[PDB]
Symmetry: D2
Subunit: 254 residues, 4 copies
């Protein structure tokens, strides 16, 4: 039960956002939810979305994770507006569609470092700031993909970013363990999201999952949300630096 | 919420049993619980224990996992007495204290194969039978230790048994995925159990955990129970073939 | 260069044996080679094989790894006949074709424990004895398959055995590190061997390898032999407890 | 035997450089060696070093891996001066000593992205260019550390860079498998190098290695070189996307 719990959810873009699947679940558990977005234009569509939730007031903040300030300030503000929080969900990442199509060896330096910045570092600084709002401790969860652990056809630069992220988690988990903050990640299966749109051979994989994954099916944002809850809750106390695959156990086969 | 859910808990020896830490948690969630023991003499002490739970009736069955029958029959009987179940918790293992003290290379063939039998195979056959009581599917969880993934001083033969077990889980998870049965494992941190008694230097490790583990503390049977619940519940739907470390994130460091 | 080096090669059944691919390579490096076989009937075919090698004398010993003695004695004898050795190659394993076809959950206890015995334990005892012939230290290598790390369709019980083996290596590596003995394993790609014959969907995999493996091709006994040499030689000094995938990098993808 | 083989060695700073330990070994095998350095001032000290090798002519090129051009041009030039090559050794990495001392969560964005750039991306672009000099294929090897796989006290940001690198390898290995180029990495144990100087907790670890590592000792640049040779040679044909721990098997314990 998540009453008296307040979580920050970063990275909602639409009803298909994975971070939304999470929100639904948390909301359904009576958690007070706070949200962050990148561009203004999103914000309206956003508020439109919230209405499907039993959130008394809508607490929306605009943070683009590339700006040290937008993050530092953004959080401080939340600290002022809602006080302390219990945890953060991090559903943010980016890469140039080019660098995902081209051969990986052709990947550009900007494209590379960019993905590293948004998809991995963001977590570090976010944690550092969120820490300030979790005096008695709390839980942080980030979203990764199997391509962080293996070379996945076409995932290219994003793969390396995820790999980087998955390590980020461990180092954070260690750094903040003492401050009683748990840091874990969810390796999600492929899901039909905004960003999932436009990727080559996506549909192929979804099918290969059904055909090969132990559960012979695919996963959804809710299932992720559920695991997310486990992780954000005291249920997963004692679990830190872990990466949980919510992917029909596709990770376990070969 | 675990009303209308019925789980079989194997491997309770006492109040310090990990499997007991699990039971408490499940009971506290309104699950109907069934138990199994190896020797009669335990059974009394056992009933004595249950009394701390809000279990209407006590359903205790005697199964030594070395006997193909005791298992086949034991389960069938449960099927008759309680009908279908939602899952099974497997907290069973054994190894000869000799083989854990001696150099690993000196390990005897019996000692070796014995541990494999009780600590790993047991799961396989248990799953096969439990399957019959989970028509609409369900969840199976086994308990492993970090020593299944790395050579841990002194864990010796038990290490290899766990390794074996952790693979057992994956192969099972794959085999029974279609039948909608999830199979996962919990890599527990060191806990003061009956069997934990008598192990060389154990106390050293417990301390090293506190000193090195991200959370700078140790874990208990409850924390495991909690994760166990996550895994046994529909919360962990979409998670199969996974090994979750409930160990203060000690698994993540080096 | 492998003159003045003497290695024991266990598990040759024919010209297609992986252990043979190894032998060729070692022989080609001037190593003195010793061999072991299970049944008499093999021995003749064996001697027939050796003739393709520049081995002055043929040193063949009969050891079935299920017999504690055949191993203890077998080695002692070698110790008497050839004195000290530099290392051992272990290309032995077994499982019942039944248990590989049936669902994994249906696996029989004998079938299970049998595979564990031959495919994993064998190593332990072999090491213990070979140790006696390597006073200044040496190198031991065993052969595993990817299915020890992931649930591979149909590998079933053999998978778990390999998993067990891969751990055996680590625990041995640790145990004998001080005695300056390195213990490592080769995760080989699928190769057309005697035992490879009769397995379901084998041909499928070989193709999937070519199509998906980074090298877009398959591997042979020689390539393994080559890596084997690296491992058995002082080249791989400082490497112990490692598992090297000679599989066109298939292990690295997903 | 490495006659008729030409390899590019990047990242020599002094006689203690790991890349130097490699060079010695390769030179000792009759390989034609090409070198790269970052700053001019190094170059002299460098030529001074070469003299210890049986290299007919010294082929030294200046490439700082942060410049897309210095790399593109640098290689093209080599292509003109020495024609085609057989492979590349990558012994380059950097991170700000600050970010390694501070808590990881405090890591600055520049510091972070910088390490990613030099320590990981560099490989990608280097590969892309070196590819052009390896028409019939070849082998690329990079140097990583255990902290890429686990949170290692103090390794902080460099850890994440290595993690990133280890993924880079896999994705490259896959991308260039078809062009018959193998890409692998060496996870080296701690070694007393120029850069190793100034790290906190260094001497401690070196000792913990001796005390805990299976081989109960430490490793040197040569041992690495040796494995490097295995990897760069046709010996490791069939091995790609692999990470080999040359660390006295410390990786295997816990
Ligand atoms: N979809 C899938 O199959 C998988 C997804 N994941 C991961 O899940 C997470 C969410 O992806 P998903 O929900 O699928 O789809 P979404 O694209 O809906 O969510 C991603 C969010 O990231 C936001 N974002 C991007 N860059 C920044 C930035 N610099 N600052 C702030 N926000 C930013 C986007 O905002 P906007 O559009 O408003 O800019 C969007 O809200 C990511 O970490 C992704 O890697 C992992 C494995 C599989
Ligand atoms: N304690 C720890 O620190 C750790 C424990 N674990 C694992 O957690 C699980 C629980 O162990 P733990 O709680 O430590 O101690 P427990 O002794 O409570 O649990 C082990 C149980 O196994 C039972 N058992 C043994 N052999 C058989 C058999 N052939 N058939 C049926 N039951 C059998 C024992 O019953 P009886 O005495 O009646 O025979 C005992 O109740 C085990 O799988 C263990 O390996 C993992 C990591 C660390
Ligand atoms: N083939 C492949 O694709 C792969 C094979 N491997 C591994 O490589 C190794 C060699 O298999 P492979 O060479 O392919 O095929 P083989 O069948 O030619 O070799 C297996 C060997 O095991 C021996 N053996 C079996 N039981 C015993 C025993 N009790 N005592 C002594 N020797 C015994 C057999 O001897 P005999 O017939 O004389 O009893 C035979 O020489 C095995 O460990 C296998 O697991 C790993 C990955 C892939
Ligand atoms: N030392 C250890 O224990 C371990 C080291 N490693 C790795 O081994 C590699 C070599 O480190 P090591 O040999 O230990 O010590 P060194 O510091 O002697 O070598 C590092 C070299 O990298 C060069 N370099 C750094 N940045 C650049 C750049 N931008 N462009 C070109 N060259 C650059 C340096 O050049 P210069 O000074 O001339 O500018 C120097 O020659 C690194 O990748 C490191 O991460 C991995 C595991 C353990
Ligand atoms: C080529 C394999 C495709 C696997 C699909 C899983 C997936 C789908 C989407 N995303 C998000 C993503 C991927 C690539 C670029 C961007 N910007 C974003 C937000 C992921 O990180 C991962
Ligand atoms: C060398 C470190 C000791 C391991 C501490 C954690 C632990 C404690 C107990 N057990 C259970 C165990 C260990 C040894 C023998 C037996 N029979 C049993 C049931 C484990 O598997 C593991
Ligand atoms: C289901 C995937 C098949 C993978 C083939 C690779 C392989 C081929 C042969 N062997 C040896 C083997 C396999 C099966 C049964 C037996 N007895 C033996 C000795 C292995 O352990 C592994
Ligand atoms: C607390 C763990 C210490 C491990 C020392 C091993 C090591 C020693 C040196 N280096 C190179 C290094 C380390 C730190 C900063 C920089 N710039 C560089 C190039 C490594 O990447 C790794």
């Amino acid at each position: 039960n998540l009453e008296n719990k307040t979580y920050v959810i970063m990275g909602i873009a639409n009803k298909r956002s994975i971070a939304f699947g999470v929100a639904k679940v948390l909301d359904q558990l009576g958690a007070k939810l706070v949200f962050t977005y990148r561009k203004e234009r999103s914000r309206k569509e956003l508020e439109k979305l919230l209405e499907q939730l039993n959130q008394p007031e809508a607490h929306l903040y605009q943070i683009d994770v590339q700006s040290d300030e937008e993050v530092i300030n953004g959080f401080e503000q939340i600290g002022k507006d809602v006080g302390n929080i219990d945890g953060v969900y991090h559903s943010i990442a980016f890469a140039n569609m080019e660098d995902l199509r081209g051969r990986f060896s052709e990947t550009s330096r900007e494209g590379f470092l960019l993905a590293q910045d948004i998809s991995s570092y963001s977590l570090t600084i976010v944690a550092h700031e969120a820490k300030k709002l979790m005096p008695e401790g709390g839980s942080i969860v980030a979203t990764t993909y199997l391509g962080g652990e293996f070379a996945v056809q076409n995932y290219n630069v994003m793969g390396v970013a995820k790999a980087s992220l998955e390590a980020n988690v461990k180092y954070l988990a260690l750094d903040l363990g003492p401050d009683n903050i748990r840091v874990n990640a969810i390796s999600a299966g492929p899901i039909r999201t905004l960003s999932a749109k436009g990727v080559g051979g996506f549909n192929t994989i979804l099918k290969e999952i059904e055909e090969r994954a132990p559960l012979k099916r695919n996963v959804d944002q809710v299932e992720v949300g559920k695991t997310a809850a486990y992780l954000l809750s005291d249920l997963s106390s004692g679990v830190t630096g872990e990466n949980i695959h919510v992917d029909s156990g596709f990770h376990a086969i070969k």
